[PDB]
Amino acid sequence: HMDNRIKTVVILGGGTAGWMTAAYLGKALQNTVKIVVLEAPTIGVGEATIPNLQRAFFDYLGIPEEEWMRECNASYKMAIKFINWRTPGEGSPDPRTLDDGHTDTFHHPFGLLPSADQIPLSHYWAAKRLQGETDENFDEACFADTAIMNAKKAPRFLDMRRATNYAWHFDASKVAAFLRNFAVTKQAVEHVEDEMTEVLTDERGFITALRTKSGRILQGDLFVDCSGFRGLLINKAMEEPFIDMSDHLLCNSAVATAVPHDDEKNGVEPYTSSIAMEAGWTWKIPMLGRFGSGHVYSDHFATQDEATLAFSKLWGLDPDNTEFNHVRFRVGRNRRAWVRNCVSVGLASCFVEPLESTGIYFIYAAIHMLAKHFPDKTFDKVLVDRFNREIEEMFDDTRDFLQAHYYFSPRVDTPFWRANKELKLADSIKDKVETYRAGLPVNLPVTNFEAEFRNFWTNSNYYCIFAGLGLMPRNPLPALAYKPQSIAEAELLFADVKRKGDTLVESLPSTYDLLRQLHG
Amino acid sequence: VPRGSHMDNRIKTVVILGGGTAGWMTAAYLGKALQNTVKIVVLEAPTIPRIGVGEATIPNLQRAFFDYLGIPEEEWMRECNASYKMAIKFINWRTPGEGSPDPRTLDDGHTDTFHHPFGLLPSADQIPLSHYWAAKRLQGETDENFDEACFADTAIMNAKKAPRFLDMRRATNYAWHFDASKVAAFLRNFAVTKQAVEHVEDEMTEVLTDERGFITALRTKSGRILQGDLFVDCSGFRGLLINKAMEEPFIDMSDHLLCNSAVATAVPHDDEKNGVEPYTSSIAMEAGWTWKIPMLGRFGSGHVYSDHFATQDEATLAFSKLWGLDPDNTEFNHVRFRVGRNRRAWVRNCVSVGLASCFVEPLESTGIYFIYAAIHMLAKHFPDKTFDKVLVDRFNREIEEMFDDTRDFLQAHYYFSPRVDTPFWRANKELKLADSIKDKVETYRAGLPVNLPVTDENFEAEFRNFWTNSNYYCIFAGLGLMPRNPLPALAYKPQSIAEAELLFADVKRKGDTLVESLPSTYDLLRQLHG
């Protein structure tokens, strides 16, 4: 017979992508494959995530949640709170007042949307809104999490009993360092601290080895490109084209820093904020003692200095005494994520702005799919194609969802906000909007990584963004006109939301107090 | 002063043309869904049920339909001589010759039988047990068949044991065999007496339509004029509303499935001597296949065939010889199928359900599923008098995807049969597979799972994940189609292979334990039915 097994995997690049890949494959391949990470020696502006990070990644490695949190100054996230996305003017951390007296805020929480008669609560709310029977906002009507967040309470009790769903804020550099230590000391991953100087390829175009400055020639059978936006393997060596998708999302730059924070005076917000700006938006990612912040913008509508000044003015920062980190984005995805024996992961594969905190998700989703489709040396084209299909569908679906945040904003006060409205929606999201406009649910949820990966953005997520921005169905779900008993049942659900919010706001600890207990 | 809200333009009356399963399932379901806000009428002429009672189903019938109506399982079973179904057992689909109820021997010594059970496939390291079995098969480490290795249900079925204990504790997943005429009469009584559905016992003589092509009323032979705002076509293959009145084209799909006829009867059965099989049998014939659907005291049986390769008399002779029936002294029911689906299931104010909408041969027991799936989608997309085209279009999209997916799965039963002994079995190989199933076969052939399930056990979830990895393995591996090589990831997972060996041992132990402790299907049936 023949032994066609992969014997060595070489990962180009460290950071979250490189060391998540190394730690995950270290577990998945059960010590049958040598794993090498080539990483040259190298601000905690903060990163936000989504709720399946613990189940899909850290639980797989057997690392307890509290253990890694304590090593990366992690905090708790119940939602993204969108501020001033509906009203004009310069950026402010404080929401503007709408005509009805409400503040210009809406939440996109992780909490579950209940249903009555197999119809989500969103649709009973929309019916009352369209029938003049309520003026209440969707997030306040349908999620107890909204009241919890308004009180800055934590998603767990002091005894660590769960109260709500949540994800995490953390220092991404510390996460990468924690995973590097794990891989090197518990999984015998080889860490080569050196610079790559040449990619060697054979007559078939397969990579055979990476040359380093010190003279190493690193043999491998499978190569994972975690080199970032430059895509030194997938784009440069393999010559795979990158698909620019700035025709769907205009922002392409960020300026960021970490801001010391008076947690005792202000408390700690259990959410990421997305604060609308004149040429983009600014994230606020709280952790203990400080929050990470970054102004995402389009350099076609603001210069770097203009964005930095606007970013500094937002928080009252002294530009001459503030350390800034600047990044120029590559927005889009490779034509194919995996070509021959080169698999791209992270920014070398694809990227969108962090408007829904999907960056780390794209990494561990891709790694999960690589392990599912893990090849041998014959590199079955079917394995490669099925992996590539999953990545492109994952990416384009989130790309579309992000575009809707801009396309349905009512703002028209700056060239940037107007320019977004001249872009075209992809067919897939236009279809979802048409379904929504008819009163129908958009991708009902089905509640396993498969199930979540295939039902990622569901009805509640679309309602949070569509209804938050002001896009409503043309009319109520018509089936509701025939269901007086189900309408009554939904009224009980609305009362449950109010009662649950009351109860939990009274009993939960502040996020600040839970963090101090978690971190000592 | 009226407010002028949308909730005032409601459908006020729904008229259902036809009874049977499609008509009375629709009436009963809408009776529940519309909460007495809509008048529901069923127009059904008195009929006499035809010979050859027996229909097989799939496991979500109770959850998705009878549970919705609040009818306990045992209550309706007792009213239609229902029995239990743990699988379809495919007999002689791999070997040549005339039809026989007894399996032929394969080259590997095993009998030519394979099961398609409803039992769940366990996983190790997120990899289904099917793939650990395939790896050992392709590596020469086992000769055991997929169904025997991976499902305890196979051993239970081989012993003809029941899927429940006498105390009604569940032992396995299962579905039902029953008399469909009795099921419909049960639902008729339920709808009329508990839901105020009106049963009009009369024949339709004319469909009245307005200038826009919407149906306004059905005229009946007695002269009554049944006005309505929404019309459900449950008239069967004739499609008297959707095809005849609305002129909606029907898409014949005989380029995917050749069988188009059936000859059926009901065979009295010596349950005391032979016991009762807890499964449907699919017995391969020279020009089709024959179903066996056991119930207490009898089994329904029907030879599905293509009249392009066998005449009615030829099929009747082969069917009768199969069971030793005297063809000249046996009551038969002959049926000609319409295989395919309408271009659109819902046109203007006419919604087609059942055979008026679409049909495939009952090779995977999907007929009643297509009915309550369509009804669930109608209730989800239920209109008002404006008949929003988006609702209609989204409904139609669901029906066409549901249908084509099952059509493809059925075609694969024939396309990957190794038989080449008659023109019928050879002809199947000259047909083309649709792109969607070719993609799935390519995925299977690379060793990958095909549509992993989303539950370790909501109608939406199951509707969008209907045929899953276990189903494809049952049929593909059952017929002899194997991956080109093991799932490549398994070469790197010795601990996971070891974990799967424990699972294989659990399957043996569970089957052994249950075969010893379970009651016979016959004894459970006698208790259920008295």
PDB file of C-alpha atoms in Angstrom, chain A residues 4-7 24 27-33 60 117-118 127 131 133 368 371-377 380-383 385-386 389 431-432 434-435 437-438 440-441 444-451 455 474-487, chain B residues 3 5-7 9-12 29 32-38 68 125-126 376 379-385 388 390-391 393-394 397 438-440 442-443 445-446 448-449 452-455 458-461 464-465 484-485 487-489 491-497:
ATOM      1  CA  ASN A   4      -0.025   9.322   2.215  1.00  0.00           C
ATOM      2  CA  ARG A   5      -0.492  10.967   5.616  1.00  0.00           C
ATOM      3  CA  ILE A   6       0.443  14.539   6.379  1.00  0.00           C
ATOM      4  CA  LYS A   7       3.447  14.337   8.675  1.00  0.00           C
ATOM      5  CA  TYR A  24      -6.681  23.433  17.817  1.00  0.00           C
ATOM      6  CA  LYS A  27      -5.747  18.619  19.895  1.00  0.00           C
ATOM      7  CA  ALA A  28      -7.434  17.482  16.673  1.00  0.00           C
ATOM      8  CA  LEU A  29      -4.463  15.499  15.314  1.00  0.00           C
ATOM      9  CA  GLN A  30      -3.746  13.638  18.579  1.00  0.00           C
ATOM     10  CA  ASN A  31       0.067  13.916  18.402  1.00  0.00           C
ATOM     11  CA  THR A  32       0.298  12.165  15.011  1.00  0.00           C
ATOM     12  CA  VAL A  33       1.500  15.306  13.166  1.00  0.00           C
ATOM     13  CA  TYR A  60     -12.500  21.707  22.830  1.00  0.00           C
ATOM     14  CA  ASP A 117     -47.656  29.389  18.368  1.00  0.00           C
ATOM     15  CA  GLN A 118     -44.295  28.889  16.601  1.00  0.00           C
ATOM     16  CA  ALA A 127     -47.938  43.763  14.601  1.00  0.00           C
ATOM     17  CA  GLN A 131     -51.465  48.634  14.314  1.00  0.00           C
ATOM     18  CA  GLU A 133     -51.059  49.524  19.743  1.00  0.00           C
ATOM     19  CA  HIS A 368     -13.037  23.690  12.677  1.00  0.00           C
ATOM     20  CA  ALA A 371     -10.050  19.679  10.839  1.00  0.00           C
ATOM     21  CA  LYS A 372     -13.317  18.368   9.389  1.00  0.00           C
ATOM     22  CA  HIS A 373     -11.833  18.398   5.876  1.00  0.00           C
ATOM     23  CA  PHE A 374      -8.315  17.531   6.992  1.00  0.00           C
ATOM     24  CA  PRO A 375      -6.463  16.078   3.976  1.00  0.00           C
ATOM     25  CA  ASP A 376      -3.741  13.612   3.219  1.00  0.00           C
ATOM     26  CA  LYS A 377      -0.890  14.267   0.797  1.00  0.00           C
ATOM     27  CA  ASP A 380      -8.481  15.453  -2.651  1.00  0.00           C
ATOM     28  CA  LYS A 381      -9.970  18.326  -4.658  1.00  0.00           C
ATOM     29  CA  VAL A 382     -13.370  17.561  -3.131  1.00  0.00           C
ATOM     30  CA  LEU A 383     -12.102  18.215   0.400  1.00  0.00           C
ATOM     31  CA  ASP A 385     -13.658  22.574  -2.638  1.00  0.00           C
ATOM     32  CA  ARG A 386     -16.053  21.801   0.229  1.00  0.00           C
ATOM     33  CA  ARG A 389     -17.473  26.655  -0.168  1.00  0.00           C
ATOM     34  CA  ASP A 431     -34.350  38.440  -0.776  1.00  0.00           C
ATOM     35  CA  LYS A 432     -34.193  38.445   3.039  1.00  0.00           C
ATOM     36  CA  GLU A 434     -38.285  41.264   0.866  1.00  0.00           C
ATOM     37  CA  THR A 435     -39.233  38.375   3.163  1.00  0.00           C
ATOM     38  CA  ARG A 437     -41.046  43.364   4.449  1.00  0.00           C
ATOM     39  CA  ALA A 438     -43.851  40.836   3.932  1.00  0.00           C
ATOM     40  CA  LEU A 440     -42.415  36.758   7.503  1.00  0.00           C
ATOM     41  CA  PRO A 441     -39.610  35.557   9.790  1.00  0.00           C
ATOM     42  CA  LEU A 444     -35.974  31.041  12.017  1.00  0.00           C
ATOM     43  CA  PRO A 445     -33.525  29.523  14.529  1.00  0.00           C
ATOM     44  CA  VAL A 446     -33.258  25.763  14.961  1.00  0.00           C
ATOM     45  CA  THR A 447     -32.816  25.744  18.763  1.00  0.00           C
ATOM     46  CA  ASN A 448     -23.374  21.236  17.915  1.00  0.00           C
ATOM     47  CA  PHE A 449     -21.143  23.500  15.822  1.00  0.00           C
ATOM     48  CA  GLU A 450     -22.723  22.439  12.520  1.00  0.00           C
ATOM     49  CA  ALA A 451     -26.194  23.638  13.532  1.00  0.00           C
ATOM     50  CA  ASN A 455     -27.975  29.062  11.129  1.00  0.00           C
ATOM     51  CA  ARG A 474     -45.120  46.657   5.118  1.00  0.00           C
ATOM     52  CA  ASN A 475     -47.806  45.007   7.256  1.00  0.00           C
ATOM     53  CA  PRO A 476     -48.144  42.535  10.135  1.00  0.00           C
ATOM     54  CA  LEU A 477     -47.644  38.835   9.577  1.00  0.00           C
ATOM     55  CA  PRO A 478     -51.040  38.049   7.985  1.00  0.00           C
ATOM     56  CA  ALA A 479     -51.472  34.786   9.896  1.00  0.00           C
ATOM     57  CA  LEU A 480     -51.746  36.835  13.106  1.00  0.00           C
ATOM     58  CA  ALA A 481     -55.110  38.235  11.969  1.00  0.00           C
ATOM     59  CA  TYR A 482     -56.542  34.725  12.572  1.00  0.00           C
ATOM     60  CA  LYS A 483     -54.939  33.919  15.947  1.00  0.00           C
ATOM     61  CA  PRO A 484     -56.519  35.851  18.841  1.00  0.00           C
ATOM     62  CA  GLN A 485     -55.425  33.162  21.326  1.00  0.00           C
ATOM     63  CA  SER A 486     -51.820  33.391  20.154  1.00  0.00           C
ATOM     64  CA  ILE A 487     -51.838  37.175  20.442  1.00  0.00           C
TER      65      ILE A 487
ATOM     66  CA  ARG B   3     -59.705  52.413  11.692  1.00  0.00           C
ATOM     67  CA  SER B   5     -56.421  48.198   9.607  1.00  0.00           C
ATOM     68  CA  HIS B   6     -55.164  45.198   7.655  1.00  0.00           C
ATOM     69  CA  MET B   7     -56.772  42.738  10.110  1.00  0.00           C
ATOM     70  CA  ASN B   9     -59.341  42.160   4.990  1.00  0.00           C
ATOM     71  CA  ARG B  10     -59.102  38.567   6.272  1.00  0.00           C
ATOM     72  CA  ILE B  11     -59.967  35.350   4.506  1.00  0.00           C
ATOM     73  CA  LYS B  12     -63.456  34.517   5.788  1.00  0.00           C
ATOM     74  CA  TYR B  29     -55.042  21.416  10.833  1.00  0.00           C
ATOM     75  CA  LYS B  32     -56.730  24.388  14.865  1.00  0.00           C
ATOM     76  CA  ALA B  33     -54.511  27.013  13.232  1.00  0.00           C
ATOM     77  CA  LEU B  34     -57.214  29.584  12.453  1.00  0.00           C
ATOM     78  CA  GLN B  35     -58.792  29.460  15.919  1.00  0.00           C
ATOM     79  CA  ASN B  36     -62.415  29.557  14.738  1.00  0.00           C
ATOM     80  CA  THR B  37     -61.984  32.836  12.834  1.00  0.00           C
ATOM     81  CA  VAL B  38     -62.548  31.190   9.420  1.00  0.00           C
ATOM     82  CA  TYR B  68     -50.642  19.723  17.170  1.00  0.00           C
ATOM     83  CA  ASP B 125     -15.189  13.207  18.050  1.00  0.00           C
ATOM     84  CA  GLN B 126     -18.021  14.849  16.056  1.00  0.00           C
ATOM     85  CA  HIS B 376     -47.688  23.635   8.002  1.00  0.00           C
ATOM     86  CA  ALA B 379     -50.497  28.119   7.911  1.00  0.00           C
ATOM     87  CA  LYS B 380     -47.130  29.881   8.177  1.00  0.00           C
ATOM     88  CA  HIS B 381     -47.748  31.805   4.931  1.00  0.00           C
ATOM     89  CA  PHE B 382     -51.488  32.178   5.441  1.00  0.00           C
ATOM     90  CA  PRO B 383     -52.741  35.171   3.419  1.00  0.00           C
ATOM     91  CA  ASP B 384     -55.369  37.833   3.632  1.00  0.00           C
ATOM     92  CA  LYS B 385     -57.537  38.784   0.668  1.00  0.00           C
ATOM     93  CA  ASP B 388     -49.319  39.012  -1.180  1.00  0.00           C
ATOM     94  CA  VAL B 390     -44.235  37.222  -1.561  1.00  0.00           C
ATOM     95  CA  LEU B 391     -46.197  34.816   0.659  1.00  0.00           C
ATOM     96  CA  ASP B 393     -43.727  32.688  -3.755  1.00  0.00           C
ATOM     97  CA  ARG B 394     -42.124  31.684  -0.456  1.00  0.00           C
ATOM     98  CA  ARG B 397     -40.247  27.707  -3.010  1.00  0.00           C
ATOM     99  CA  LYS B 438     -24.555  14.556  -7.811  1.00  0.00           C
ATOM    100  CA  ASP B 439     -22.951  17.021  -5.393  1.00  0.00           C
ATOM    101  CA  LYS B 440     -24.026  14.927  -2.397  1.00  0.00           C
ATOM    102  CA  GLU B 442     -19.382  13.455  -4.682  1.00  0.00           C
ATOM    103  CA  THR B 443     -19.252  14.516  -1.024  1.00  0.00           C
ATOM    104  CA  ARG B 445     -17.423   9.529  -2.243  1.00  0.00           C
ATOM    105  CA  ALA B 446     -14.678  11.691  -0.670  1.00  0.00           C
ATOM    106  CA  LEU B 448     -17.259  13.274   4.098  1.00  0.00           C
ATOM    107  CA  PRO B 449     -20.614  13.314   5.900  1.00  0.00           C
ATOM    108  CA  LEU B 452     -25.023  16.122   9.222  1.00  0.00           C
ATOM    109  CA  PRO B 453     -28.161  16.327  11.396  1.00  0.00           C
ATOM    110  CA  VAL B 454     -28.826  19.316  13.641  1.00  0.00           C
ATOM    111  CA  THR B 455     -30.411  17.417  16.555  1.00  0.00           C
ATOM    112  CA  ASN B 458     -39.220  22.115  16.043  1.00  0.00           C
ATOM    113  CA  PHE B 459     -40.772  21.437  12.643  1.00  0.00           C
ATOM    114  CA  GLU B 460     -38.647  24.073  10.888  1.00  0.00           C
ATOM    115  CA  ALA B 461     -35.399  22.410  11.974  1.00  0.00           C
ATOM    116  CA  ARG B 464     -34.670  22.053   6.508  1.00  0.00           C
ATOM    117  CA  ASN B 465     -32.603  18.972   7.459  1.00  0.00           C
ATOM    118  CA  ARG B 484     -13.435   5.999  -2.509  1.00  0.00           C
ATOM    119  CA  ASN B 485     -11.427   6.022   0.740  1.00  0.00           C
ATOM    120  CA  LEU B 487     -12.593  10.022   5.841  1.00  0.00           C
ATOM    121  CA  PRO B 488      -8.981  11.279   5.726  1.00  0.00           C
ATOM    122  CA  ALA B 489      -9.177  12.899   9.171  1.00  0.00           C
ATOM    123  CA  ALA B 491      -5.921   8.621   9.870  1.00  0.00           C
ATOM    124  CA  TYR B 492      -4.860  11.175  12.524  1.00  0.00           C
ATOM    125  CA  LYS B 493      -7.295  10.191  15.308  1.00  0.00           C
ATOM    126  CA  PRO B 494      -6.373   6.857  16.934  1.00  0.00           C
ATOM    127  CA  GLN B 495      -8.138   7.859  20.162  1.00  0.00           C
ATOM    128  CA  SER B 496     -11.335   8.558  18.240  1.00  0.00           C
ATOM    129  CA  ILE B 497     -11.197   5.207  16.441  1.00  0.00           C
TER     130      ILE B 497
END
